From Swiss-Prot, chains A, B:
Outcome following mutation: residue 105 to A: Abolishes enzymatic activity. Abolishes oxidation, association with mitochondria and protease activity. No effect on chaperone activity. Reduces binding to OTUD7B. Removes the glycations and restores histone 3
Gene name of the encoded protein: PARK7
Keywords assigned: Acetylation, Autophagy, Cell membrane, Chaperone, Copper, Cytoplasm, Disease variant, DNA damage, DNA repair, Endoplasmic reticulum, Fertilization, Hydrolase, Inflammatory response, Isopeptide bond, Lipoprotein, Membrane, Mitochondrion, Neurodegeneration, Nucleus, Oxidation, Palmitate, Parkinson disease, Parkinsonism, Phosphoprotein, Protease, RNA-binding, Stress response, Tumor suppressor, Ubl conjugation, Zymogen
Cofactor notes: Deglycase activity does not require glutathione as a cofactor, however, glycated glutathione constitutes a PARK7 substrate.
Site (Cleavage): 148-149
Matching NCBIfam families: not_thiJ
Stored Gene3D superfamilies: 3.40.50.880
Cysteine sulfinic acid (-SO2H) PTM positions: 105
Known outcome of mutating residue 52 to S: No effect on mitochondrial translocation neither on deglycase activity
In-chain residues carrying the UniProt-annotated modification N6-succinyllysine: 181
GO biological process, one term: positive regulation of protein localization to nucleus
Native species: Homo sapiens (Human)
Protein name: Parkinson disease protein 7
UniProt PTM comment: Sumoylated on Lys-129 by PIAS2 or PIAS4; which is enhanced after ultraviolet irradiation and essential for cell-growth promoting activity and transforming activity. Cys-105 is easily oxidized to sulfinic acid.
Annotated compartments: Cell membrane; Cytoplasm; Nucleus; Membrane raft
Amino acid sequence: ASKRALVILAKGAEEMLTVIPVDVMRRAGIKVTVAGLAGKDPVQCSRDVVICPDASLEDAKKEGPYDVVVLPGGNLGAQNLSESAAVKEILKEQENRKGLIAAICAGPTALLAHEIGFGSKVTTHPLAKDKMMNGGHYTYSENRVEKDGLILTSRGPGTSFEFALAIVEALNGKEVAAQVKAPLVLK
Amino acid sequence: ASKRALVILAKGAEEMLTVIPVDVMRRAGIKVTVAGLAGKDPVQCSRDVVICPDASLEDAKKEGPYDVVVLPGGNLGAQNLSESAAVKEILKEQENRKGLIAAICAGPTALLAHEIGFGSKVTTHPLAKDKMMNGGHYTYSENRVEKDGLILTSRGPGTSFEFALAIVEALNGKEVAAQVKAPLVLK
């Protein structure tokens, strides 16, 4: 039985922060669904790369649950995630079933919006710290990847391989993560 | 006047090796055209991410010339690039006008196919070395990014930020590259 991941893709998402985790998780043999927040239609990312989702979020939700829910960053993408009642429901249910939630760069600010994981240690992009920390509901970290139990966060494009491999390690173990890492030519 | 880049996107291209350079070049203010080898239609990448190109290669060619032509990797994508007469023509013309050509991972093997840049120092993904070196037409390097004049090559997903920033430096200078790099959270 393979592990499954839901990646929620909204307009204005950071395309690197979307594609690196999708690709690395697929290299790990995880079954990844790229779900469009707004529907099935192509999604215009922050730097104008246009990605076609595998399914709408509505449809993907019916095929869950997932071993991880992944929230890419990009400020406008994170805002769209934060404003969505559907994302609220998915994240609450994932938290309620003790499933992993992974968010990168401004992505973790959607956890704040939906009151997910309060009391956890988290990181974000440096420019998203103040937003994430409004109210003091989390403890901030400058680690490149932070994992406090079932809340896994990371900082930016340059930490996205580390983030993705941390998801792989959490789901499939350290040995699979190491095997996936070697062909990537990381430093 | 901004610099312009042509990124040639074929079926089976490595989506990280496509998106990271597109995004980082756009962050640098380069005008990037993602051109579909096969036409305007969406492109299925190696790990099944589907990207919609900005234009067909046929149309993009008419809007050149470009300050850089970028060839992503992915073995099947590189093979498609290598089999295309249109790519041959674009690369020969770029070489003839003394314009930069940048290729990452198996991407440089399309330079071999089209007899581009012989006598240059190059790198590739480790698994693409033997293919690239057939005939001894290039000198191999293990540097993460190699630039021998107007032929710029790199090794893999984990070197793609370095590759993209090397393109930025070549076109827009070291200071712009440094400014684009800082918000990425590189190690």
